[model samples]
Target: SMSYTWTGALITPCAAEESKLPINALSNSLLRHHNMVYATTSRSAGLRQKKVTFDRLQVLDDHYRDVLKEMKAKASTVKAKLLSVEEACKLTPPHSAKSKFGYGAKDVRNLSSKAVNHIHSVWKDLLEDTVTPIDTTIMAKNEVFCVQPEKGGRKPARLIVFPDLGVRVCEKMALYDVVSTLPQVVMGSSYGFQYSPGQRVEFLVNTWKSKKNPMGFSYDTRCFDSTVTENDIRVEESIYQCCDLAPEARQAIKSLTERLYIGGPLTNSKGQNCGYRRCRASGVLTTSCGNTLTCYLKASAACRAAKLQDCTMLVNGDDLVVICESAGTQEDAASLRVFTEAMTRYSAPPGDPPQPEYDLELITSCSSNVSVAHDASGKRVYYLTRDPTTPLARAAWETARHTPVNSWLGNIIMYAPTLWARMILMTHFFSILLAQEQLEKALDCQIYGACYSIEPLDLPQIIERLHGLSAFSLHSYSPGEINRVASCLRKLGVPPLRAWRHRARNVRARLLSRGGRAAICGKYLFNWAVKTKLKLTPIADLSSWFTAGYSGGDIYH
Candidate 1:
């Protein structure tokens, strides 16, 4: 015999092999099945209604089938081609020594020739396409030069000249010829360099001729003589500084200079990149001063009456009214009178005091039980028992009405809002249902060592033991472990087995039909199975099992 105590109730014991015992174990299963039946029936009824209204199930089915076929055809038509890295590399030239350029004016010039060498180096590197220099003078005039390699070079040619170099020159001269003259003079005169095959040259030039230098060339010219000189008095920076200012302006400047200017840290204050400081930088400060102030205000208001009483001298009274009735025992009528008089006088203001109005009619009716009031607001209205005969019973009734029935019922009601929240919530519920079904199916299989293996024997004891085991472990087992047990039971030839193989197809149909409830249930079942089989404590905990933390490295450390 087995006995159990839940809460304060003692449940009667029954034999382990009795049907009643298994029935008790199956209470949860029965409830789950009932919900499943209700769901199925409701969906079936809906389908029936749709059938009666439009008779479109067959049409819908055919249409969907055709749609699926077309989709598959489309998918087949769109194919993804995968190419190997080597194959892709074959389409382009290989990076080799021939692709590299080392000869340039900068590389060839003597270091001791500072100005000449610097100009030569700059031009050489620019011609080699290694670095670019901004033509600031041309930029100031809102003009730009488009640089490119000149034609007529040997194999793997180098860039020689930049046409449209923006040097102010006459329009009659070709842009290339004008720009080429500068390089020609440099290479022919001081450099004494001979042009070779594959060597680069520039020619084209365009600019404002009005901005000219002494040698009939533009100030924007690239030659050393055409370049701007530091001695140019009109272009000096000293002419732009402002010295005259009011006393107030000077005072503001002096004040500003007194404030300390802290430069930003060498690294960000978050210290994310600092290995030793990363963990220590997570704290944040928050203020509770506003909340504290509000609490203090409320406390002060509550204590004001007591504080005022300490300063009070005496209590004051106002006018009073009284009503009296005299009844004659033999007469059929009674007379009533209302009298009003001043009870006490005090030095008060002449005008009427701002007193709260009393609904005397309502109060009288309530006290005499001549009227009943009902609250229209949805908020619960608590009523205290006024019954003189059965005060205890009335009190008990009120207590029972207000007391929460059970935690489980609360859970159910709490989940009510979630049921209609979104499709996912419905999916979650259905998943649980499907999971329960699967579990039951697995349990149907016979264990190898059960006494009922060969003969028709009462297996209620086995069921009871299984129920106890489930109760003890249901909250703790991972989905993997649960699924493992389910799989094991199924392998042992359990009855009421779930057909997971067909689940995918059914799920597809359900999704297409917009059967959210069914889909959610299936998802729940899958999640539950995964949770149980994996021996994970919570279904969510399995997420961590699938992810790996980053391994420590020297740079990270």
Candidate 2:
């Protein structure tokens, strides 16, 4: 027995550059051999076999941050309603000359103060609890090898013969390399390998035959062949040998070696024939390798495509997996309708009613609390808050649909305060203004006239005065309240102005005559007047006095 010292190289670079070097140079180089044994081992194998545990803390931290950022970005796009005391007052009509003065004073004294406090509370809550971070960890192990060979004698005088003893080491190292490199070969395919217990993998045996002893050669060859039967035959070893042998010897040996191929003609559980020619040509027992590889490729492609499609659907706010299998033809419209009805009936949960208006209302409320409803005359009246049509009854539905819906939002709320605060501030303001509008509309028809509508003119000024008074009087209140007051006031004037502009544009586009322009102008002016009534100004003397008081002394007095 001769002791053979082995050397190894990194498989990746060697495999890439194999064609550039000579046989002896390649063999001597790292590409042809690896000293490390490769084997299939579960993710837990490293811990079990080598006491190596992977620390996933760093990876988890990165994933958490990524999810947080995504949630924050999503929240930023959400608009909220924040109403200033002045804006809320403006939504109510003064009704009388004294009432105008009184409403302005009351708004400055009460509404403004309340708005500031409520704004602060809502803002703080929104900022404080809007997002939460999610934590997750997945554990895995890897297989590695410690190569050691049996003791041997000195080298023989003639051709060297190497036994199969060290083949385990090679197999272990090769399999390890394959498993470790799998992630790189197939992105996101991180299922690590695991070997069947008691399984053995075969490698090429270096056998020498002397013509002097026919019985010795026969016995040794038979033993070698028998050894291969017990192990998982790696035919690449022979292919490698063929590539290395002399041209005439390789050709002669190739024909004789066909009888040893072991990876062809296998069928899957599906009864599909395994398609591998090398095993068939070599007369080897075909392992399921061919079928497995084929299936893996197909499944891998489908998985990747599915993942990509899912990601796209998520970003686009579309339903996942539930595809619209409706036919395109109008002739198939009835069939499509039937199919959709059946799908809805079967797939949708029981008691799920078709509430398109309610659904739209919920979406609108969550997005901005801005919604339009048609009256008996078909006039579209935009509702800022909860109304009969967009009532408080809908809040539960909206909350169900939108409240910190997933781990993404939770992480954002937990990790990013400023962004979360902004979202909460917006949502609170929108909700408040919309609710106030609904409240005013409900009160408008009452005989008692208990709910006075503030004219819009005094709204902005009243809010400003209230904020100034609050800052002077309630110095301890959070600064968020002042910001909310301002945001609400600013947002109130936007919708009506937008409606006016849009209506004006539509009128001009469709009506080509001067009458059309005049009619559009008249409507725009009328709406503007209505907006002005909503902006009712307080008596100049009272407003001037309030401004002076707000500027000179704290309202707390």
Cα lDDT tens digits for candidate 2, 38-64: 222222222221211111111112322
RMSD of 2: 37.1
Q: Over 4 Å off in model 1, which ranges? A: 1-483, 486-498, 515-557
How accurate locally, in lDDT, is each candidate? 0.18, 0.22
After the best TM-score superposition of candidate 1, give how far the Cα of residue 281 lies from its true spot, in angstroms.
Answer: 48
Q: For model 2, what is the error of residue 209's alpha carbon versus the real structure, in angstroms, after optimal superposition?
A: 90
**Location of the lowest summed lDDT over 10 successive residues in candidate 1:** 278-287
In TM-score terms, candidate 1 sits at 0.12
